[PDB]
Amino acid sequence: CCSCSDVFQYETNKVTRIQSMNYGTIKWFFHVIIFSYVCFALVSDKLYQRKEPVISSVHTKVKGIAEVKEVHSVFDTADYTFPLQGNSFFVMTNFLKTEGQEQRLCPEYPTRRTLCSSDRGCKKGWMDPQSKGIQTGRCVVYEGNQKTCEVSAWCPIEAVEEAPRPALLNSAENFTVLIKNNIDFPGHNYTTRNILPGLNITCTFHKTQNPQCPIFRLGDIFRETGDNFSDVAIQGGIMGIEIYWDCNLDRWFHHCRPKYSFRRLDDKTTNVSLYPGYNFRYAKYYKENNVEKRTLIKVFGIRFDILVFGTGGKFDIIQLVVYIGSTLSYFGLAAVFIDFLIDTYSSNCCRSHIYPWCKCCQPCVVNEYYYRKKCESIVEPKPTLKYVSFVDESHIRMVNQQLLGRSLQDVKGQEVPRPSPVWCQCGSCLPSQLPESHRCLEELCCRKKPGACITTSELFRKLVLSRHVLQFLLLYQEPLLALDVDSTNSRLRHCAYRCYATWRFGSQDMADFAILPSCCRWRIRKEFPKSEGQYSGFKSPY
Amino acid sequence: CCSCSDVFQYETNKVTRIQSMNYGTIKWFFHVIIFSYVCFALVSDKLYQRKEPVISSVHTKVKGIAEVKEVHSVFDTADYTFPLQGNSFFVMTNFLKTEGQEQRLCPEYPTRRTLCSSDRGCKKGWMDPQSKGIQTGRCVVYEGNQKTCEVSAWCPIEAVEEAPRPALLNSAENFTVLIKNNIDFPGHNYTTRNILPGLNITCTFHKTQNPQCPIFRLGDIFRETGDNFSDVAIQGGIMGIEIYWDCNLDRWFHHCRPKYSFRRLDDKTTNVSLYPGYNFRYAKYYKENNVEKRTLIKVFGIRFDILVFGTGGKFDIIQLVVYIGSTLSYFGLAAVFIDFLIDTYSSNCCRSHIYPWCKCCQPCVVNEYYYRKKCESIVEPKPTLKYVSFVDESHIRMVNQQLLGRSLQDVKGQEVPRPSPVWCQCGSCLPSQLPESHRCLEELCCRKKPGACITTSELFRKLVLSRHVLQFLLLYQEPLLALDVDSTNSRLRHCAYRCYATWRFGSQDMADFAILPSCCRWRIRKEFPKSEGQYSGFKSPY
Amino acid sequence: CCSCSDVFQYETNKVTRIQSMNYGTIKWFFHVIIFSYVCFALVSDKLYQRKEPVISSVHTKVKGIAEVKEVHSVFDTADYTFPLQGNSFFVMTNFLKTEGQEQRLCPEYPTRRTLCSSDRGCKKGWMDPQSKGIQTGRCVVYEGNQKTCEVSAWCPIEAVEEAPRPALLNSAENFTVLIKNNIDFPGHNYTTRNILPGLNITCTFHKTQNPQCPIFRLGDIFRETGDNFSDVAIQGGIMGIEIYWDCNLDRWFHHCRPKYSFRRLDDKTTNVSLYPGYNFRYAKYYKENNVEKRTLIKVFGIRFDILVFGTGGKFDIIQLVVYIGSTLSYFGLAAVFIDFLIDTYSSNCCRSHIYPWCKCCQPCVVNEYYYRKKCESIVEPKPTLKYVSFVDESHIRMVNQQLLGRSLQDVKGQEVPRPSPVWCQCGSCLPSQLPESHRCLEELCCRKKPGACITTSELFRKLVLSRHVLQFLLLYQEPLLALDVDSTNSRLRHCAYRCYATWRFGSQDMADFAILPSCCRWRIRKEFPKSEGQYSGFKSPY
Ligand SMILES: Nc1ncnc2c1ncn2[C@@H]1O[C@H](COP(=O)(O)OP(=O)(O)OP(=O)(O)O)[C@@H](O)[C@H]1O
Ligand SMILES: Nc1ncnc2c1ncn2[C@@H]1O[C@H](COP(=O)(O)OP(=O)(O)OP(=O)(O)O)[C@@H](O)[C@H]1O
Ligand SMILES: Nc1ncnc2c1ncn2[C@@H]1O[C@H](COP(=O)(O)OP(=O)(O)OP(=O)(O)O)[C@@H](O)[C@H]1O
Ligand SMILES: Nc1nc2c(ncn2[C@@H]2O[C@H](COP(=O)(O)OP(=O)(O)O)[C@@H](O)[C@H]2O)c(=O)[nH]1
Ligand SMILES: Nc1nc2c(ncn2[C@@H]2O[C@H](COP(=O)(O)OP(=O)(O)O)[C@@H](O)[C@H]2O)c(=O)[nH]1
Ligand SMILES: Nc1nc2c(ncn2[C@@H]2O[C@H](COP(=O)(O)OP(=O)(O)O)[C@@H](O)[C@H]2O)c(=O)[nH]1
Ligand SMILES: *[C@@H]1O[C@H](CO)[C@@H](O)[C@H](O)[C@H]1NC(C)=O
Ligand SMILES: *[C@@H]1O[C@H](CO)[C@@H](O)[C@H](O)[C@H]1NC(C)=O
Ligand SMILES: *[C@@H]1O[C@H](CO)[C@@H](O)[C@H](O)[C@H]1NC(C)=O
Ligand SMILES: *[C@@H]1O[C@H](CO)[C@@H](O)[C@H](O)[C@H]1NC(C)=O
Ligand SMILES: *[C@@H]1O[C@H](CO)[C@@H](O)[C@H](O)[C@H]1NC(C)=O
Ligand SMILES: *[C@@H]1O[C@H](CO)[C@@H](O)[C@H](O)[C@H]1NC(C)=O
Ligand SMILES: *[C@@H]1O[C@H](CO)[C@@H](O)[C@H](O)[C@H]1NC(C)=O
Ligand SMILES: *[C@@H]1O[C@H](CO)[C@@H](O)[C@H](O)[C@H]1NC(C)=O
Ligand SMILES: *[C@@H]1O[C@H](CO)[C@@H](O)[C@H](O)[C@H]1NC(C)=O
Ligand SMILES: *[C@@H]1O[C@H](CO)[C@@H](O)[C@H](O)[C@H]1NC(C)=O
Ligand SMILES: *[C@@H]1O[C@H](CO)[C@@H](O)[C@H](O)[C@H]1NC(C)=O
Ligand SMILES: *[C@@H]1O[C@H](CO)[C@@H](O)[C@H](O)[C@H]1NC(C)=O
Ligand SMILES: [Zn+2]
Ligand SMILES: [Zn+2]
Ligand SMILES: [Zn+2]
Ligand SMILES: [Zn+2]
Ligand SMILES: [Zn+2]
Ligand SMILES: [Zn+2]
């Protein structure tokens, strides 16, 4: 069935170009706003570029010294900064040291959960998360008359003490951090650093004056987020330095520079905050007197997490070509909307109810014309599909229901606008010669109500029964037909059926399923007799 | 060529509305399942919301003490936890310390790769990854009769010793970790913490009883993943605490709370595992006797990586509007499928082979009707395009092939259903007056097989040759044509060609490329003579 | 208005199948390249699989020892590696130690910013980021005649000293790192490790010979990126070990193995580099003589960041089904292009200018035929819409403009190809009986230029005025119409208007808005008189 002809064939939809100005306004508005929006998305979001995330690597150095008044001591970088290499770094701003701790037995600190009245109160080997040593069955005196359960631990047990305010290293707001950041785009093959040639180191980052100096003062970091460093220093906190690398690697429009933002990554430290701060414990272990002692320090400080994010984009053909396709179909949505306004405003319900009431959508009656000139109604050509027309009526009843042993005259069907026997009402219908219930189909009168027949009209005589016009139509199809055979009379009879069907039913597909009235059918059979045998019924082409 | 009329014009496709119930079933099923699926994707995946990832910041504190039996010592937080600030934290559960190491020369430990028979076996300066000191040319006795190559290193060299089982700090399953987690959505501007007001600290996380208490017991973490802490503690491992923040920031339906999950990020520790555990080495450096010594500790423990992931979504108009478009086109796929079932079930191969065999798809013959009423066949109007019809046949041969100096009577063409000279077979065809090979086109007889001609039929006389009907048709187009000029006879002749072409070829576009038989053409020319000059050939409109 | 019939109805577009070979070539080329491309995207990018990122966990151990010549000492793993657990690890390759530092007062190192001429130069309590101690008002002699401001700090203050070249631990290129990496796909439930059973540990990673051995020599890592380890070791650097896990978890085609790549994450160390290296400071605190001293070490080394990335994919039905839809519409773009080539090449401007000049796109004239057989022009049926035809002309003027009190004869309209009073030019037009300005519409002559009328032609007499043909047409619609009533004469008159409108205007929708000439209208009214009252005007159906 296939051929080079079937291969080389193009399908294009039949369209009807409506000249409606209103529809033109709507269509152009939709297309313009979709184009204006999608063109923006392309320019603003750089959807024409292939984009790659940064591969960052941060190195931080804190400079500054603090005079701690605990005797006065001096704290350098090696004293307050802890070995956090990478994105985050820590700056201790407060501490509580319990020095000289040695592994031995000692009375517990008088916490409310450690007081005893006798040795019966304290258990042996008992441990709980708030306990700083394994309890012993004895309850020793701590000091004076205070009796606390004795434990084996690093002694003296560190006191339950509030964080010392003001912060011992509240000078930490004067410390500066240099942040060296290298980004790499491997797919785009572009490496760069936030430190540029000719960079003064005496600078300090300022949001406007010096936005590209990577030496940030900690106090300025805190005052750029509306935080109080003095309050945060006492108990600690978490702060965050965002570095945003928005880079386009096009040589025409090239810019790949960092943008520094600051954001507290912790709950605000208020007077009634719930479990605030950032503290941990670490110990310095030293051997003296041939015994190992430790200095236990509870460190409260600010942890600065450095969050380097960004993207580097370079122009790519493939990305633009896909985005194009996506934006190209959006324009089509305009048609769907208007096609709906055509289908909805074509319904008879619009004219029945809404038009007489609103009276504002009255000139929207042309949608019936548009729908008539756009959509065509076609019914499944099932065998049960039939059509019946009566003279007294102006509409054709589609008989879609298979006859339940009832005369087709009585059978009711769906109305369609046009493009003697008991059932007979004209007086000229003859009884059906068809057997079984097949006769039901042929039991059809020319009109529903009693009155004059249709075959009595001279139009039926000189149009359907006229041998001249039928013979002329036969010659038209076959210019050399043999007219002396009884098959000529049979073809004459077939044409009379098809002309009554087309004369009465305007459409050809509607006349394909025509069933003629008994009066007209038998008048035709008399005018064009077959004596070979029984006449055949209506037979559906499908 | 452009006009405000061209600007304001709408294109809508012509459609034919099929009333097929089967096609309606298929279309509605497709639309319903696409709508039901896409509505789900919207509700389930929250595709109507703009979603942002969390910006987390974890702070962990481990509480608990262990009685290590190595002499009995006590290990606090500062003793087993190592300075890992951030997501991960480490809890030492085993160790091997080689204390008192001093920088000097010593015999190597008797590893199989360090035994010597004499000083010739050991090289000077030799180093390999399993060597713990630079070898010296001498081979000193370690102990008794064991001779091992002498090295310069921290001495005594740490023994190659198995991890001490049971774990020295197997009490570490009783330790609790508080995890403080703050998430931030900057675009949505929403900050929150996993610790809520009114949080008892005596709680411990339970999967059902207390799911929101952020104090996790390590043994419970391990038993919630079916791990044996006692086996993992001996050699170490890696564990992972996932915190899932699924948040929707809509005030109507607001919930942003963590969900804690546990997952071992390490290979299961079996009896025959390959290189299991998690250990490292670190040294404590102390100066005594004015010389620097170090305690080298091989630490085996569990590293808990805290993996905070999630998304916070808030309702956005733009996201819903794009998703709508995507889901809106899926419905259209229903038409493609049915349109195919129409195009496929219309082919003659369906009736030729499949219908007589299967006999089940017999009522699917209406697809031929649907295809006839939907698709129209149109052929390229190239100059070579021609049409030839013979009386004895019922189909028209499209002559698409340019004539290779052969009479058009002999030329064969593709069949199309209808909507004396050697080549002559009727006896009335006259020789072509056309010159060169142009005559070939005009060398065409009314019929393929010998027999009666077509011009002898009275229909050709009173339809094509009839001056009355031709003159009437001319008056129809021009109601005031001058009938006394020879141009009237020329227009009469042109109409006779066009009527024979339309009488014989039903379609107008098929009659545009008609080539009349020589007999009919010359009969027309005789009935409507031109004596001014030679008659013109068939000339294609394109 | 709704019915089970409206529910079960299918919309299919009317298409015209063009047999153009050129259009077939273009359509098949577009479809083939779209299919060939989208099939590739599916195979290459594995778009048919659901893909999940890895959940990695890296553990690193460095082996190797260095002979440092500072007296000769030996550095083990515990000496050069710093407590960096996780992805990154650090290997010290150089240092500068200032040992024996004690908290006291000392002269500042003679930096250019610390020299004084007297105690007036140095301030008390002054601090700046390059200062290593709080200044005191006194200016003490450092050595000889060098006078430097005295400070309180850890003394002696560390000298401003260049990094010692060659690197003290330049043997660090001989160190090996074992990297243990476990990936987990939770959604796909697949866990694996880069260390396989039967793995020799004597191996060292080689790009080709031994690509899966996870023991990397640092010198080889540097020589695989074209770096000089000896130069990098002196001042430090940042290096990166990428581990790529491209896994497909389909049992048929299963492969999940790592791929090791190396990339320097730092600026190249040249002779004139800007702020190169990677160094920090840390202190060892020891108590001797009952006083606390510290050894301050400036460590220069290489930080190796381990970047584990990858994806594991498994076949998913839903992902393939969505991708299908996206690729399925791309094919449709072929039609849009050709439909445009049809619409563009149909314009008259193509034939007017481009065709006579280029002469190469001459056979592209068939696009006019395609457009004629594809697109149909329809005009809004507004009440103001009118049509006027004159005998002397061959085109119909659409009068879309509402008449401004001017005779319709004078009014000009847009030309459309066909499918006595002052305004009168025929001499037979009668004055309008219509009142107000409504007469303007009826003031229309049969022709624009003076000459013979149209009603004098016998065709108008025997077609429009002929009572026989009009009566026959009336009988056709109603085979039993009463012909003896004056309503028969009124229907005769209505049919004469509609036939003149259809005889003159070919289209039915164009004849719906016809306005007849005054001569023909009044001739019809005389031939079919109404004496009941005034005759009505042209009234628009909409
Ligand atoms: N926190 C800081 N505040 C101000 N300047 C700084 C800071 N950290 C480093 N610098 C300066 O930046 C320059 C380059 O820094 P870098 O640390 O790489 O070199 P450096 O010689 O090792 O620095 P230094 O020895 O002073 O710690 C140096 O001149 C250093 O003085
Ligand atoms: N691992 C843990 N197990 C149980 N409770 C804990 C743990 N870590 C902290 N807590 C309790 O949680 C509360 C808040 O913790 P947070 O550390 O911020 O305050 P804190 O006073 O510094 O804690 P602490 O001094 O007891 O270490 C404290 O009351 C503390 O006792
Ligand atoms: N950097 C390295 N170079 C070479 N081999 C190594 C390195 N690190 C570990 N190995 C070897 O890999 C094997 C498994 O490593 P793993 O550390 O898990 O076991 P281990 O017994 O604790 O190793 P070790 O005690 O030798 O440090 C061991 O046999 C070890 O010798
Ligand atoms: N449209 C239509 N066709 C009919 C009707 N009755 C019969 N036919 C057609 O006419 C044919 C039978 O005609 P018939 O009277 O038997 O004459 P014969 O076929 O020459 O013997 C069948 O093929 C039918 O398709 C009718 O009521 N309406
Ligand atoms: N359809 C069709 N048209 C023809 C044929 N032969 C000639 N014509 C048309 O008739 C015209 C030539 O007619 P001709 O005999 O020369 O009469 P003349 O044009 O008045 O001199 C040309 O324009 C052709 O388009 C034919 O076989 N078929
Ligand atoms: N197409 C067209 N229709 C017309 C014209 N003039 C009148 N009509 C129609 O003819 C009808 C009026 O005819 P009229 O002379 O009053 O006869 P009557 O309706 O029987 O009284 C109206 O319904 C109009 O639609 C015209 O110029 N062109
Ligand atoms: C920070 O420095 C300024 C000037 O150097 C000084 O006035 C201020 O007191 C310092 N802050 C603290 C907390 O010491
Ligand atoms: C990246 O760019 C450098 C400089 O042009 C070039 O030497 C190198 O080969 C490039 N790498 C790739 C992967 O193309
Ligand atoms: C850096 O800036 C400071 C600002 O006071 C200036 O004094 C100094 O000279 C600058 N250094 C250089 C190298 O420009
Ligand atoms: C900052 O904190 C300090 C000490 O807590 C307090 O004295 C001061 O008033 C605070 N400043 C502001 C602006 O709240
Ligand atoms: C953990 O604690 C429970 C009760 O506090 C105790 O019975 C158990 O022995 C402890 N586990 C270890 C390993 O010490
Ligand atoms: C975030 O919310 C707070 C509280 O309403 C408001 O003060 C702040 O300005 C907001 N930030 C932004 C970026 O809108
Ligand atoms: C916390 O829970 C424990 C459970 O035993 C209870 O004893 C204790 O009183 C609770 N504390 C508070 C503050 O509710
Ligand atoms: C857990 O490990 C210990 C020591 O390795 C062993 O005695 C015990 O049976 C193990 N428990 C289970 C459930 O395997
Ligand atoms: C690295 O080892 C090789 C052979 O073991 C040796 O020749 C070379 O000198 C070593 N490199 C350094 C910097 O010591
Ligand atoms: C993952 O696979 C293992 C082995 O088949 C199975 O025991 C376990 O239940 C699976 N987990 C899930 C979430 O299906
Ligand atoms: C590992 O490879 C080395 C290569 O020299 C070889 O000598 C050694 O025997 C191998 N070990 C094993 C267990 O195969
Ligand atoms: C590597 O560095 C060393 C010392 O800086 C130098 O002697 C040697 O020439 C360098 N090698 C190369 C290939 O540049
Ligand atoms: Zn009857
Ligand atoms: Zn009847
Ligand atoms: Zn012939
Ligand atoms: Zn012939
Ligand atoms: Zn006139
Ligand atoms: Zn006139």
Nearest to C338 among A10, A85, A460 (CB): A10
Is residue C240 within 8 A of residue A57, CB to CB? The reply is yes
Nearest to B480 among C349, C369, C457 (CB): C457
Query: How many angstroms separate the CA atoms of B409 and B187, rounded?
Result: 82
Query: How many angstroms separate the CA atoms of C153 and C151, rounded?
Result: 6
Query: How many angstroms separate the CA atoms of C181 and C158, rounded?
Result: 41
Is residue B132 within 8 A of residue B158, CB to CB? The reply is yes
Name the residue at shortest CA distance from atom 12 of ligand 13.
B200
Strand partners, B292: B287
How many structural domains does chain A have? 3
Q: Residues near B37 by Cβ (< 8 Å), separated by ≥ 6?
A: none
Last residue of a domain, one of A263, A285, A312: A312
End-to-end CA distance of chain B: 23
Is the residue at C405 inside a domain? yes
Interface of A with C in 267-326 (CB under 8 A): 284, 286, 288, 325
Query: How many angstroms separate the CA atoms of B232 and B220, rounded?
Result: 13
Q: What DSSP character marks residue A108?
A: P
Residue type, C58: V
Is the residue at A421 inside a domain? yes
Best CA proximity match to B281, nearest among A294, C282, A85, C61: C61
Determination technique for this entry: cryo-EM
Residue A318 φ/ψ, nearest 5 degrees: -65, -40
Query: How many angstroms separate the CA atoms of B2 and A519, rounded?
Result: 61
**Best A7, A8, A11, A12 residue to mutate vs chain C (most C CBs within 10 Å):** A12
Atom of ligand 10 nearest to the CA of A230: 2
Is residue C148 within 8 A of residue C121, CB to CB? The reply is no
Measured from the Cβ of residue B298, the count of other Cβ atoms closer than 10 Å reads 18
Q: Inspect the interface and report whether the beta carbons of C15 and A12 lie closer than 8 Å.
A: yes
From C225, C231, C234, C300, the mutation candidate for ligand 18 (largest count of ligand atoms within 8 A of CB) is C231
| Tokens found for residue C50 | 């659901």
Q: Is C19 on the interface with A (CB under 8 A)?
A: yes
Interface of A with B in 404-433 (CB under 8 A): none
Strand partners, B388: B397
Atom of ligand 2 nearest to the CA of A281: 27
Strand partners, B59: B180
**Best B2, B3, B4, B10 residue to mutate vs chain A (most A CBs within 10 Å):** B10
The reply to whether B308 and B325 lie within a common domain is: no
Query: How many angstroms separate the CA atoms of C300 and C236, rounded?
Result: 5
Query: How many angstroms separate the CA atoms of A216 and A339, rounded?
Result: 62
The reply to whether A327 and A430 lie within a common domain is: no
Residue A255 φ/ψ, nearest 5 degrees: -155, 120
Ligand 18 binding pocket (C-beta < 6 A) is C 228, 230-231
Q: What is the DSSP string of B430-490?
A: PPP---TTHHHHH---S-SSSS--STTSHHIIIIIS-HHHHHHHHHHH-TT---SSHHHHH
The reply to whether B296 and B424 lie within a common domain is: no
Judging contacts by C-beta atoms under 8 Å, the chain B residues touching residue A381 are 366, 369
Query: How many angstroms separate the CA atoms of B131 and B125, rounded?
Result: 11
Cα torsion angle, C490, C491, C496, C497, sign:
positive
Which residue's structure tokens are 């979709």?
Answer: A34
The reply to whether B180 and B290 lie within a common domain is: yes
Q: Inspect the interface and report whether the beta carbons of B129 and C57 lie closer than 8 Å.
A: no
The reply to whether B390 and B264 lie within a common domain is: no
Query: How many angstroms separate the CA atoms of C279 and A60, rounded?
Result: 10
The reply to whether C395 and C522 lie within a common domain is: yes
Atom of ligand 2 nearest to the CA of B62: 1
Is the residue at A341 inside a domain? yes
The reply to whether B239 and B267 lie within a common domain is: yes
Is the residue at B350 inside a domain? no
Q: What is the DSSP string of B379-442?
A: ----TT-EEE--TT-SEEEEE-SPP-S--TTT---EEEE----SS-SSS-PPPP---TTHHHHH
Is residue B440 within 8 A of residue B403, CB to CB? The reply is yes
Helix (H) or strand (E) holding A155: strand A146-155
Best CA proximity match to B307, nearest among B86, B499, B65, B43: B86
Q: Is B68 on the interface with C (CB under 8 A)?
A: no
Measure C21 CA to ligand 5 centroid, in angstroms: 29
Q: Torsion-angle region of residue A439: left (phi > 0), alpha (psi -120 to 50) or beta? A: alpha
Which residue's structure tokens are 């698409």?
Answer: B400
Q: What DSSP character marks residue A491?
A: H
Q: Which ligand sits nearest to residue B186's alpha carbon?
A: 12
End-to-end CA distance of chain A: 23
Cα torsion angle, A204, A205, A211, A214, sign:
positive
Is residue A130 within 8 A of residue A160, CB to CB? The reply is no
The reply to whether A280 and A161 lie within a common domain is: yes
Q: What is the DSSP string of A386-399?
A: EEE--TT-SEEEEE
End-to-end CA distance of chain C: 23
Closest chain A C-alpha to B140 CA, distance in angstroms: 30
Query: How many angstroms separate the CA atoms of C357 and B409, rounded?
Result: 39
Q: For residue B22, with 0-12 CB atoms within 10 Å meaning exposed, 13-18 middle and 19 or more buried, which class applies?
A: middle
The reply to whether A33 and A65 lie within a common domain is: no
Q: Where are the beta strands (DSSP E) in A316-413?
A: 375-378, 386-388, 395-399
Is the residue at B260 inside a domain? yes
The reply to whether A296 and A176 lie within a common domain is: yes
Last residue of a domain, one of B312, B330, B358: B312
Query: How many angstroms separate the CA atoms of C450 and A377, rounded?
Result: 48
Which residue's structure tokens are 């481990």?
Answer: B62
Is residue C432 within 8 A of residue C397, CB to CB? The reply is no
The reply to whether B421 and B283 lie within a common domain is: no
CA contacts within 13 A on the Cβ side of C287: 16
Strand partners, C73: C68
Best CA proximity match to A239, nearest among A253, A250, A226: A226
Q: Residues near C3 by Cβ (< 8 Å), separated by ≥ 6?
A: none
Q: Inspect the interface and report whether the beta carbons of C74 and B133 lie closer than 8 Å.
A: yes
Best CA proximity match to C299, nearest among C175, C172, C176, C110: C172
Is residue A122 within 8 A of residue A111, CB to CB? The reply is no
Nearest-Cα residue of chain A relative to residue B193: A267
Q: What DSSP character marks residue C464?
A: I
Interface of A with B in 368-407 (CB under 8 A): 370, 374-382
Query: How many angstroms separate the CA atoms of C440 and B220, rounded?
Result: 99
CATH number, domain with residue B325: 1.10.287.940
Query: How many angstroms separate the CA atoms of C90 and C233, rounded?
Result: 12
Q: Inspect the interface and report whether the beta carbons of C59 and B278 lie closer than 8 Å.
A: yes
Best CA proximity match to C286, nearest among A284, B289, A227, B136: A284
Nearest-Cα residue of chain C relative to residue B261: C186
Q: What is the DSSP string of C136-168?
A: EEEEEEEETTEEEEEEEEEESPPP--PPPSS-T
Is the residue at B532 inside a domain? no
Q: Which domain holds residue A171?
A: 57-108+157-312
Resolution expressed in Å: 3.0
Is residue A338 within 8 A of residue A21, CB to CB? The reply is no
Q: For residue A272, with 0-12 CB atoms within 10 Å meaning exposed, 13-18 middle and 19 or more buried, which class applies?
A: exposed
Q: What DSSP character marks residue C88?
A: -
Q: Is B18 on the interface with C (CB under 8 A)?
A: yes
Is the residue at A127 inside a domain? no
CATH number, domain with residue A251: 2.60.490.10
Is the residue at C78 inside a domain? yes
Please give the interface size between A and B, counted as residue pairs whose CB atoms are below 8 Å apart: 189
Query: How many angstroms separate the CA atoms of C398 and C378, rounded?
Result: 12
Nearest to B19 among C9, C195, C199 (CB): C9
Distances (CA, A) of B443 to B414, B446, B518: 19, 10, 6
Buried b (16+ CB within 10 A) or exposed e, C314-351: bbeeebeeebeeebebbeeebbeebbeebbebbbeebe
CA angle, C106 as apex, C105 and C108 as ends, to 5°? 130
Residue A447 φ/ψ, nearest 5 degrees: -150, 150
Radius of gyration of chain B (CA): 50
The reply to whether C399 and C486 lie within a common domain is: yes
